[PDB]
């Protein structure tokens, strides 16, 4: 699946976003939204800000 970079450190603030840090390596499970993408952050699935991320193709 695509996978994407984190480029910022970013603790979830809800119940629906996930935590990462900077160099993380995710997996994006969903990103029809423009501002909140769905990822999997090793084990836990969840929101984090789009543009923290960059995807890698």
Same mark, same amino acid.
């Given at each position: 699946k ?15 976003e ?5 160099? &993380?390596?995710?997996? /994006? /499970?969903?990103s029809?939204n423009? &501002? ?6 090793? &084990? ?11 995807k /890698? &193709?």
């Amino acid at each position: 699946k695509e996978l994407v970079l984190a480029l910022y450190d970013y603790q979830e603030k809800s119940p629906r976003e996930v935590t990462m840090k900077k160099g &993380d390596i995710l997996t /994006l /499970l969903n990103s029809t939204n423009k &501002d909140w993408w769905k990822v999997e952050v090793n &084990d836990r699935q969840g929101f984090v800000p789009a543009a923290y991320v960059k995807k /890698l &193709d």
